[PDB]
């Protein structure tokens, strides 16, 4: 624990500073240290955690995709060495390491100690996301098992959110958006992805009349992402 000597409050403060500076690797390390203090995260602190690793792994994924595309071309009239595979493997292993770290945090001990529905679904969404990222690069005997670990995490979160949260809750909507992307491009189930995105969107639309103005900006943003995926998918 490189962050073991720093106060929890200082770690949170420095995670927010890193966010303002778009230093997401630092931000993730500070929030990892904060989690390892053993206390549960607040609503605001959970968002710092997810944003940090989302951006770290997001850049790794985009780079992995660039390299995997170059690798695919190299294996088509293409001239031969091992360098492209080697560097793709380097980025891939670094990506898997970050996913393993996030999943370990969720397992020790954020998920088990989360009692309120909002936090439980939040962390189960994260668990599904980072197993999905592992599935994006998986090609061996583990792909099928990795895919089902994502499905199982996403599904439990779905069951909780449909029981404990209103249709317009931003965490419930974000979970549904990502579970539908899982169906579409991981689980080879585009019809399930389309059905979920549409029922999710429609039921949030019919519930907007209950919300106060300018207090569901995040829910609106996610409803637009659902509409964009549907436009692309249909």
């Amino acid at each position: 624990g490189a962050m073991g000597s720093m106060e929890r409050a200082s770690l949170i403060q420095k995670a927010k500073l890193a966010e303002q500076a778009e230093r997401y690797e630092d931000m993730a390390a500070f929030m990892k240290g904060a989690v390892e203090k053993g206390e549960e995260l607040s609503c605001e602190e959970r968002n710092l955690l997810s944003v940090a690793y989302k951006n770290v792994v997001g850049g790794q994924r985009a780079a992995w995709r660039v390299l995997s595309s170059i690798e695919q071309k190299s294996n088509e009239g293409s001239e031969e060495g091992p360098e492209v595979r080697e560097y793709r493997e380097k980025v891939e292993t670094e990506l898997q390491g970050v996913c393993d770290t996030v999943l370990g945090l969720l397992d020790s001990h954020l998920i088990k100690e989360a009692g309120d529905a909002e936090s439980r679904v939040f962390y189960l969404k994260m668990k599904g996301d980072y197993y999905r990222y592992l599935a994006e690069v998986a090609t061996g005997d583990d792909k099928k098992r990795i895919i089902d670990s994502a499905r199982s995490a996403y599904q439990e979160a779905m069951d909780i959110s449909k029981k404990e949260m209103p249709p317009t809750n931003p965490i419930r909507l974000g979970l549904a958006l990502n579970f539908s992307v899982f169906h579409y491009e991981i689980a080879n189930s585009p019809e399930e992805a389309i059905s979920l995105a549409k029922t999710t969107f429609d039921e949030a639309m019919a519930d907007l009349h209950t919300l106060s103005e300018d207090s569901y900006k995040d829910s609106t943003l996610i409803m637009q992402l659902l509409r964009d995926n549907l436009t692309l998918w249909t």
Binding site: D129, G174, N178, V181, E185, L221, L225, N229, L232
Partner: peptide
Amino acid sequence: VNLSI
């Protein structure tokens, strides 16, 4: 590209 959050 598929959009996630």
